[PDB]
Amino acid sequence: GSAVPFHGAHQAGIATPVQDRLHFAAFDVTTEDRAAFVALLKEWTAAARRLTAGHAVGEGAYGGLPEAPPDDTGEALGLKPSRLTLTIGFGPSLFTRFGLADLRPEALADLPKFPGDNLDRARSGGDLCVQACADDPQVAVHAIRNLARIGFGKVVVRWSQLGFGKTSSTTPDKQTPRNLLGFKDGTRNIAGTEKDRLDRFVWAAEKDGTPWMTGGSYLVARRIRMHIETWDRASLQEQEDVFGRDKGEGAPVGKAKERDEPFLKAMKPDAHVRLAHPDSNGGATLLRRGYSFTDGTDGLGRLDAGLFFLAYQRDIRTGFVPVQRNLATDALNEYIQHVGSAVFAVPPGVRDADDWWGSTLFG
Amino acid sequence: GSAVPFHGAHQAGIATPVQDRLHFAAFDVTTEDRAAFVALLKEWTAAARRLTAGHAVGEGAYGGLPEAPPDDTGEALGLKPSRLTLTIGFGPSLFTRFGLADLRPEALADLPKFPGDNLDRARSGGDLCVQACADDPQVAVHAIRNLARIGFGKVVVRWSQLGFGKTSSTTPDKQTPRNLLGFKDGTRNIAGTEKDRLDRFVWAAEKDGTPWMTGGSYLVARRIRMHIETWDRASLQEQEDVFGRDKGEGAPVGKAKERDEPFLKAMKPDAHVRLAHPDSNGGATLLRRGYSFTDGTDGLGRLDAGLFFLAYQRDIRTGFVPVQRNLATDALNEYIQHVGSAVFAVPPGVRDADDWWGSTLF
Ligand code: HEM
Ligand code: HEM
Numbered sequence A: 001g002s003a004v005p006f007h008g009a010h011q012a013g014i015a016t017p018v019q020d021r022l023h024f025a026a027f028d029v030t031t032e033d034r035a036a037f038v039a040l041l042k043e044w045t046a047a048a049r050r051l052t053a054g055h056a057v058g059e060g061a062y063g064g065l066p067e068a069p070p071d072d073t074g075e076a077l078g079l080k081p082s083r084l085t086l087t088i089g090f091g092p093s094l095f096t097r098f099g100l101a102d103l104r105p106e107a108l109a110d111l112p113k114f115p116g117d118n119l120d121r122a123r124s125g126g127d128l129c130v131q132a133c134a135d136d137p138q139v140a141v142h143a144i145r146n147l148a149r150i151g152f153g154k155v156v157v158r159w160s161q162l163g164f165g166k167t168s169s170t171t172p173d174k175q176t177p178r179n180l181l182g183f184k185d186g187t188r189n190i191a192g193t194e195k196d197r198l199d200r201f202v203w204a205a206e207k208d209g210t211p212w213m214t215g216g217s218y219l220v221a222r223r224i225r226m227h228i229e230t231w232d233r234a235s236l237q238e239q240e241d242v243f244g245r246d247k248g249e250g251a252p253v254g255k256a257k258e259r260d261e262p263f264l265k266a267m268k269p270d271a272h273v274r275l276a277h278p279d280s281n282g283g284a285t286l287l288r289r290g291y292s293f294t295d296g297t298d299g300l301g302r303l304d305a306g307l308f309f310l311a312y313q314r315d316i317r318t319g320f321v322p323v324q325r326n327l328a329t330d331a332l333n334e335y336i337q338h339v340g341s342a343v344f345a346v347p348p349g350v351r352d353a354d355d356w357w358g359s360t361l362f363g
Numbered sequence B: 001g002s003a004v005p006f007h008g009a010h011q012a013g014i015a016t017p018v019q020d021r022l023h024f025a026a027f028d029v030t031t032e033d034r035a036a037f038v039a040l041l042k043e044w045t046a047a048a049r050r051l052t053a054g055h056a057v058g059e060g061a062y063g064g065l066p067e068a069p070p071d072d073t074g075e076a077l078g079l080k081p082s083r084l085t086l087t088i089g090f091g092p093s094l095f096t097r098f099g100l101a102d103l104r105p106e107a108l109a110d111l112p113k114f115p116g117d118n119l120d121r122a123r124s125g126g127d128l129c130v131q132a133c134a135d136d137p138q139v140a141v142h143a144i145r146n147l148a149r150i151g152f153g154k155v156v157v158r159w160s161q162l163g164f165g166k167t168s169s170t171t172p173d174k175q176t177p178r179n180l181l182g183f184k185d186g187t188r189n190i191a192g193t194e195k196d197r198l199d200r201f202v203w204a205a206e207k208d209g210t211p212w213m214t215g216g217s218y219l220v221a222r223r224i225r226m227h228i229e230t231w232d233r234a235s236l237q238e239q240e241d242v243f244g245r246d247k248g249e250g251a252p253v254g255k256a257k258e259r260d261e262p263f264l265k266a267m268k269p270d271a272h273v274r275l276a277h278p279d280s281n282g283g284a285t286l287l288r289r290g291y292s293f294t295d296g297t298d299g300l301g302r303l304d305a306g307l308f309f310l311a312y313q314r315d316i317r318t319g320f321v322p323v324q325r326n327l328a329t330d331a332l333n334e335y336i337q338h339v340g341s342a343v344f345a346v347p348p349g350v351r352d353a354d355d356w357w358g359s360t361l362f
Helices: A032-051 A090-096 A137-150 A195-201 A236-243 A272-276 A319-329 A331-335 B034-051 B091-098 B137-150 B195-201 B228-230 B237-245 B272-276 B322-329 B333-337
Strands: A021-029 A085-090 A126-134 A156-166 A217-228 A291-297 A304-312 A335-348 B023-029 B085-090 B126-132 B155-163 B217-226 B289-292 B306-312 B336-346
Touching: A021 A272, A032 A085, A032 A137, A032 B195, A126 A137, A126 A217, A126 A335, A137 A156, A236 A272, A236 A331, A236 B091, A272 B336, A291 B137, A304 A335, A304 B155, A319 A331, A331 A335, A335 B237, B023 B137, B034 B085, B034 B137, B126 B336, B137 B155, B155 B289, B228 B333, B237 B272, B237 B333, B272 B322, B306 B336, B322 B333, B333 B336
Parallel strands: none
Antiparallel strands: A021 A126, A021 A156, A085 A126, A085 A335, A156 A291, A217 A304, A217 A335, A291 A304, B023 B126, B023 B155, B085 B126, B085 B336, B217 B306, B217 B336, B289 B306
16 A cells, blocks of 8 residues: 555554565654754644655655755655654653653663663664655655755754565565564464454553553664675574574474474573574564664674664563573674663554644643 | 565666665675685575575574584574565775785776764775665565674674665655654655766776676765754744745745756755755765664663664766765755765676576685
8 A cells, every 4th residue: 555544543553564665763852841842842743644644744855945955855755655654762862851851751761781681772762753654755854854954953864764564566475574583474473464462462551551652652672784795604503493494485493384383392491583583472463664784884894784673562571681581602693792772661552633743742 | 475586687776676674784704715715605505595585594593403504594484585675785995815916997986084973984985785675674684684694604793784674766656764863865866767967976887997796886985973862852834944945745936736846046055955965966866775773772861863864876986976965955964964884886786596696816
């Protein structure tokens, strides 16, 4: 299809179909004035309604007064909506402003330091995030560029990441994408069709303790670099032993088909799938929604590439934290390094044309 | 999703319709052994025939000996060819090696310094290049990664550039794309169907003085940063005056339609289109084939944005050089800065299955 509805009980971009491209930006707030920030949230919501329907922001990209700057920067003229979704989230650091310290959710937990972390502070944290997903990367980039412009003076861009998954024009919808290590990635995940599993593992409930967050979710972002040239020198058997699945079909060891249920005891004890599986983690289950990245080459001639990992969950303490803790001895650790991190509370949806991002928090 | 043929009198990736994505790499050569370098060019050609047809390199991505690394890294399994083209070029620095000094073409000129240049030496130059274009970014990355792997020990990657979307057109029958300043870019180019114009302005000829280059072209690459904070506070009138075309339709000033011919005297004397047009440059004409990029933030609160400019021509001295010299007074200079540069000789095409990249030189 061509557009995804913006309004709902939940924000789009979580349980809605996974689009081909990502532009993820983290923002820091520069104003101390609560009223000015609320005004910004309203203006951003109005812009998002236009962007996600394939229209220009404000009075448009051309045809206004000649002596004024155009309201929209114009680089998406002639493109389609491209299934654009715009999803906003609030970082822990936002709650030190505007008198919000007692409204930080307990489920918005700070992450511990994990073994092997090498986090770049410049590509970590942030007061706010906007996740822009679309099938055309120019549509996503135009949305972030225009939100940043509207906000100039009240927010700045802290860090930015582009990503890619499948190209839907050429690749069937039911084919699992492969990551840059060459393995199928996403076989055993929560799907957007699974309403009850979303209620159990993804959406915040009123009884969880934070009423303004009901119908929201919690997001963990990790920029994970792969050591591509080292991986590519490993034997086929070494690569398959790291995961617990074969490379060609992606079946669990000792099984024949991709979607055959794993037998964990046949895998090596420190294989990635064995460590990450819910049965190894007291039932903990995540919605993964990440994207591959390739940024260029570093100063040594090596490919700067990896996985921009995104996970949504009902509570960070019972989702990401236990699972990532269990990966302390993962065989995959030889080939990856976590180099960026951030966490966000993703509020409930925009209910109708009069509602605005963050209305349950700000009032 | 279809394949573009690999063999021909010319290399594909020049006159070919412009694909959605770019992955460009420049390599330096680390071996002094001519025979070893020739062996590499042949192995690379064999791999390119597989990649451009959507097949894995060598013996495949899986199902070999358990104790060996796979011949193909595997991340393009199950994907279509996606109009992948692979175009090789040789830089001036190559010709100091392997006894090639006397074969360097005259048309492969070093560029002069231009006012306003701020060139990063680490993301400039290179002994050789591979331009990978495709509609699927994963297919383009897979191609460059596998070539680099095959070349381990004989070549190293010097610098690379990814382009997330095209800012050029060789197909005037299709919609012209916009650059990150919001203007259509590619209206007046050279089309892939204009055989006479390609022969006059793009392909090298025997008579030009370097026989091994007959059927090849010359490439200039320029990495250009855009001052988007400065641009985004400019008025609509200011923006349109810079180019000489209106923003919405992209018509020449005064006219109604994109493809109506420019009337240069109605444009400001420093307008980009007026300065760059062939009639302002003694007839000099280029094939433009560039892409947009964004490489994160700038560390000062803003998105980074730019354009990776690529131009093909029959002789650098009669194509890019005169045009860029004429741009010394361009209104656009207020909003851009050139920060990387490289030139390459792009050899003729691979004629058939027994031929190989660079065979006319070696
Ligand atoms: C570069 C980093 C990573 C790569 C390449 C990677 C790759 C994979 C692959 C190939 C699978 C198996 C197919 C599938 O079910 O999706 C998998 C499964 C999984 N991964 Fe990872 N992964 C990475 C990081 C992480 C992280 C950081 C977490 C969580 C903290 C995680 C959690 C999981 C989970 C929960 C499963 C499903 C296990 C099951 O229920 O069968 N992964 N991963
Ligand atoms: C960021 C840098 C640049 C931007 C944003 C830009 C933008 C544009 C735009 C909007 C047009 C009009 C539509 C078209 O006919 O394509 C154009 C035309 C053109 N540009 Fe540029 N350009 C840039 C750099 C350059 C450079 C470096 C050169 C050559 C040295 C160049 C050569 C041309 C030529 C030859 C034309 C066609 C003129 C004609 O025959 O009508 N441009 N450019």
